[PDB]
RNA sequence: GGGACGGGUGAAACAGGAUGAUCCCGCCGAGACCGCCGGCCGCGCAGGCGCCUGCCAAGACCGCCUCUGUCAAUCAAGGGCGAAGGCCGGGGGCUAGAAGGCGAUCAGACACCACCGUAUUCCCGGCCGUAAACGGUGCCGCCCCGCGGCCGGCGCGCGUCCCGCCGGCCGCCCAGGGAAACCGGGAGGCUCCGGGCUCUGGGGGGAGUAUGGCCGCAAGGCUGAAACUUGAAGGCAUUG
């Protein structure tokens, strides 16, 4: 992948993890 | 041709910067001018940028110019 | 001896040949390159422009006009500044129709400082 | 009403496949394209003198 | 549609008395019918006329200046025009520019002694000396400032208090030009120093006396 | 990818940032010191009719006016339309017009 | 005013027009912008910097037989500024235009091309602190074959020029250097290795991730592992 879009994908992943850990 | 650095020729030494000469020295000097209407004579710095007057006159007789200074209607010398 | 003004709009996509009086407020004959053709891509060509000018000649001789000043323009604005293909064809079809020529001038509208033209900062990617 | 022009000289092969030739005919110096084999001083039948060849 | 030119008629247009080719042309209008009066709707039209058409013969000199004249009275079947502005042609303006030199543009507001207000645009360029080593003509700021100030004081002196007919005399004579050079030549080398535009910003509503003196020679 | 040019493909000397111009063919944004620049002076009427306008002119001493246009293109459009060519490694150093 | 199409494209189609458009000319409104001149020009600590006129404070350089007397260099912590996009609260709203809508193309086209358009783009008060933020080259000091161009200040000479000096921005280049490309105002004076100071790296992945901490309204930013996996990844250059 072009590294810019890999960074975008990783940011979306980290934000999903923060949201799921927010519950409980 | 064989130049010796310990005794440089003064003519080609005066054309260099005052600080990178063998022995640093000033570039300026003093000189005598005569008032256009007074018999007497006064001694003036060559790079002046401050008022200089006659013994009699109240008009300033020098024009500062960023280098050697010019004068108004007076005739000069070198001593 | 009876002067009018010819405005020739020589653009990318069509041509206009338009004769008015000296003030511009009253028109005497107006034709376009797209009223002589069937294919949309041939409206700005030299041949449509010449056949349209030949009928402008017919209109404006019968109304008594004998000479024209020429004001020729491109699109202008923030777009193209060079003339379309039919521009000089109108002038030639005017010279070979009997009209005499006065003053000539370019009237393309040029800005002194401008708004932003379309396309984006990467251009038309074709 | 077609006119008779006369080739004054030959300028070269125009199209991408040979084919037509650019010629100077004649009191004018009109330049036109021809399909056939043209020598010098050939007479051509022009349907109009209005159109001039490109370049 | 019926052909509207069955109801049209043409009127002459006449230039002020300063010029020589006093006939500009004719203009068409629909005959009076109802409420629209023929000699009410052709009033105040604006005509751009080349100076080489108004004073013919000196083509090299007069061929790049244009005068704007607008009618302000229709008397005895004739339209009587008055000064509306001055402008140079587009190719003349484009020709003045090169790379390596300086361009100076200045404008100012000048009242006249008979109720007008003009905006005057002047342009000047720097030039080579006959014996200089370099090929660029750029000048320092002490020179640009002096050139601007000289232009201001000159246009203040020459056009400070003039009338419209005297202004038109000078504009069609290039008198003012021939002195903007004179002021600016004592400073640097400069090639094309000219008034490039005159705009009319505001005028009195009634100009009957001005029009009367402009048309009948006086 | 080593370095191809000493000027890095532009003319930028002792400054941080320069102005933006629009390519006249495709309208992309180009820095001013990189864009390809050409000046042209031409006649408003084509030369192939430059004597028939002249002979059908009433004004005595008329001279055909000219057009003054500065064309500016981006790198891609300049190569595509043959304003500049791809050159040999030795030839790239030549600045002659 | 005049009377049949105009727009748009490689070619077209959707938008427009007898409620008269497109086109010509005059008048009015609003908000952006600052052309040609414009550059191997110039300025600033970097980010950056171009309409007119006025005001305000500053700056480096040069020139000097002016004053002081080591008052300096580099810098964890700490402070300040910082393109564009983005955020909070007000204002404004022309143009262009993420999102969205629509016409084509195509096997498909949710894209490229055409058309319409919201945030945004502009102003004010704050926040955020990142860019291929590049010369991919930290700062101070010394020596260094030469030939040129341009910018600022000064000095000598003849009769604008001409030869120098200092400071800046550039081109070419002997030696020397290097894996080479190339550098050469250093990337030279270095296996013949030591002038001073600060920062960073130690095969490729995993990974700039998990976790903890600080900052932020948020979007983020800064700091930052391990298990495990693998025999290469990479630089510059030659022939096809
Ligand atoms: K990256
Ligand atoms: K990236
Ligand atoms: K990114
Ligand atoms: K020296
Ligand atoms: K000295
Ligand atoms: K001195
Ligand atoms: K049609
Ligand atoms: K605009
Ligand atoms: K546009
Ligand atoms: K648009
Ligand atoms: K678009
Ligand atoms: K774009
Ligand atoms: K755009
Ligand atoms: K776009
Ligand atoms: K873009
Ligand atoms: K971009
Ligand atoms: K791009
Ligand atoms: K982009
Ligand atoms: K585009
Ligand atoms: K200045
Ligand atoms: K100054
Ligand atoms: K200035
Ligand atoms: K590489
Ligand atoms: K590289
Ligand atoms: K570049
Ligand atoms: K620069
Ligand atoms: K610059
Ligand atoms: K160029
Ligand atoms: K490009
Ligand atoms: K049609
Ligand atoms: K705008
Ligand atoms: K300038
Ligand atoms: K300059
Ligand atoms: K300048
Ligand atoms: K500057
Ligand atoms: K400068
Ligand atoms: K300068
Ligand atoms: K400048
Ligand atoms: K400047
Ligand atoms: K001094
Ligand atoms: K210190
Ligand atoms: K130190
Ligand atoms: K520091
Ligand atoms: K620090
Ligand atoms: K710190
Ligand atoms: K900031
Ligand atoms: K920012
Ligand atoms: K925003
Ligand atoms: K808006
Ligand atoms: K706005
Ligand atoms: K956006
Ligand atoms: K879309
Ligand atoms: K897509
Ligand atoms: K795609
Ligand atoms: K739109
Ligand atoms: K937004
Ligand atoms: K907005
Ligand atoms: K923007
Ligand atoms: K805005
Ligand atoms: K910001
Ligand atoms: K980086
Ligand atoms: K760079
Ligand atoms: K450092
Ligand atoms: K200089
Ligand atoms: K200099
Ligand atoms: K300077
Ligand atoms: K200088
Ligand atoms: K100098
Ligand atoms: K100098
Ligand atoms: K020096
Ligand atoms: K120096
Ligand atoms: K120097
Ligand atoms: K330097
Ligand atoms: K440091
Ligand atoms: K570091
Ligand atoms: K680092
Ligand atoms: K690091
Ligand atoms: K965590
Ligand atoms: K918070
Ligand atoms: K919150
Ligand atoms: K928020
Ligand atoms: K949060
Ligand atoms: K968070
Ligand atoms: K975090
Ligand atoms: K490799
Ligand atoms: K690598
Ligand atoms: K690689
Ligand atoms: K690499
Ligand atoms: K090699
Ligand atoms: K290799
Ligand atoms: Mg000195
Ligand atoms: Mg801060
Ligand atoms: Mg801040
Ligand atoms: Mg818009
Ligand atoms: Mg829009
Ligand atoms: Mg960073
Ligand atoms: Mg960086
Ligand atoms: Mg870096
Ligand atoms: Mg320079
Ligand atoms: Mg430079
Ligand atoms: Mg250099
Ligand atoms: Mg380390
Ligand atoms: Mg955490
Ligand atoms: Mg944490
Ligand atoms: Mg190799």
UniProtKB/Swiss-Prot annotation, chain E:
Keywords: Cytoplasm, Ribonucleoprotein, Ribosomal protein. Pfam families: Ribosomal_S3Ae. One of its GO terms (molecular function) is structural constituent of ribosome. One of its GO terms (cellular component) is cytosolic small ribosomal subunit. It is found in: Cytoplasm. InterPro entries: Ribosomal_eS1, Ribosomal_eS1_euk. GO terms for biological process: translation. Component of the small ribosomal subunit. Mature ribosomes consist of a small (40S) and a large (60S) subunit. The 40S subunit contains about 33 different proteins and 1 molecule of RNA (18S). The 60S subunit contains about 49 different proteins and 3 molecules of RNA (25S, 5.8S and 5S). Belongs to the eukaryotic ribosomal protein eS1 family. This is Small ribosomal subunit protein eS1.
């Amino acid at each position: 992948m072009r590294a810019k879009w890999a960074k975008k994908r990783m940011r979306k992943l980290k934000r999903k993890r923060r949201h799921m850990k927010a519950r409980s | 041709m064989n130049v010796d650095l310990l005794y440089p020729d003064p003519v080609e030494e005066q054309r260099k910067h005052k600080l990178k000469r063998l022995v640093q020295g000033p570039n300026s000097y003093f000189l005598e001018i005569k008032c256009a209407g007074c018999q007497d004579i006064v001694v003036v710095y060559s790079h002046a940028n401050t008022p200089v007057f006659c013994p009699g006159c109240t008009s300033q007789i020098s024009i500062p110019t960023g280098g050697k200074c010019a004068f108004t209607s007076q005739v000069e010398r070198y001593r | 001896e009876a002067f009018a003004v010819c405005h020739i709009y020589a653009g990318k996509n069509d041509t206009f040949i338009h004769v008015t009086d000296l003030s511009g407020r009253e028109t005497i004959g107006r034709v376009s390159g797209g009223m002589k053709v069937k294919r949309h891509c041939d409206e700005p060509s030299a041949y449509a422009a010449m056949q349209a000018t030949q009928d402008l000649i017919e209109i404006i001789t019968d109304r008594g006009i004998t000479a024209v000043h020429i004001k020729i323009r491109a699109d202008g604005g923030t777009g193209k500044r060079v003339y379309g293909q039919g521009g000089s064809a109108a002038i030639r079809a005017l010279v070979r129709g009997g009209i005499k020529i006065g003053r000539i001038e370019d009237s393309t509208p040029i800005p002194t400082d401008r708004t932003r033209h379309k396309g984006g900062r990467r251009g038309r990617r074709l | 009403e077609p006119i008779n022009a006369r080739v004054i000289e030959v300028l070269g092969r125009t199209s991408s496949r040979g084919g037509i030739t650019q010629v100077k005919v004649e009191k004018r110096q009109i330049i036109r394209n021809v399909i056939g084999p043209v020598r010098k001083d050939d007479i051509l039948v022009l349907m109009e003198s209005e159109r001039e060849a490109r370049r | 549609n019926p052909d509207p030119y069955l109801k049209k008629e043409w009127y002459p247009v006449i230039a002020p008395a300063h010029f020589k080719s006093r006939h500009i042309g004719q203009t068409p209008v629909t005959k009076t019918a109802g409420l629209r009066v023929a000699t009410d709707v052709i009033n105040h039209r604006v005509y751009e006329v080349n100076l080489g058409d108004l004073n013919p013969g000196a083509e090299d000199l007069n061929g790049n200046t244009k005068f704007y004249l607008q009618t302000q009275l229709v008397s005895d079947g004739k339209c009587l025009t008055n000064f509306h502005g001055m402008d140079i042609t587009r190719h003349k303006y484009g020709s003045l520019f090169r790379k390596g030199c300086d361009c100076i543009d200045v404008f100012m507001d000048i009242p006249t002694t008979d109720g007008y207000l003009l905006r005057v645009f002047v342009i000047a360029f720097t030039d080579r000396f006959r014996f200089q080593r370099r090929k660029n003509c750029h000048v320092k700021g002490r020179v640009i400032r002096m050139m601007r100030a000289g232009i201001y004081e000159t246009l203040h002196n020459e056009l400070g208090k003039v009338s419209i007919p005297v202004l038109v005399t000078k504009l069609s004579n290039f008198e003012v030009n021939a002195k903007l050079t004179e002021a600016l030549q004592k400073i640097t080398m400069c090639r094309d120093v000219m008034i490039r535009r005159v705009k009319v910003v505001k005028r009195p509503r009634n100009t009957m006396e001005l029009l009367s003196t402009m048309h009948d020679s006086n | 990818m080593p370095v191809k040019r000493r000027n890095n493909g532009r003319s930028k000397y002792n400054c941080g940032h320069t102005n933006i111009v629009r390519c006249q063919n495709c309208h992309r944004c180009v820095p001013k010191d990189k864009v390809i620049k050409r000046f042209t002076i031409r006649n408003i009427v084509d030369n192939t009719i430059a004597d028939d306008v002249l002979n059908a002119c009433v004004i005595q001493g008329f001279a055909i006016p000219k057009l003054y246009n500065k064309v500016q293109y981006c790198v891609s459009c300049s190569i595509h339309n043959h304003i500049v060519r791809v050159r040999s490694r030795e030839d790239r150093k030549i600045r002659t017009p």
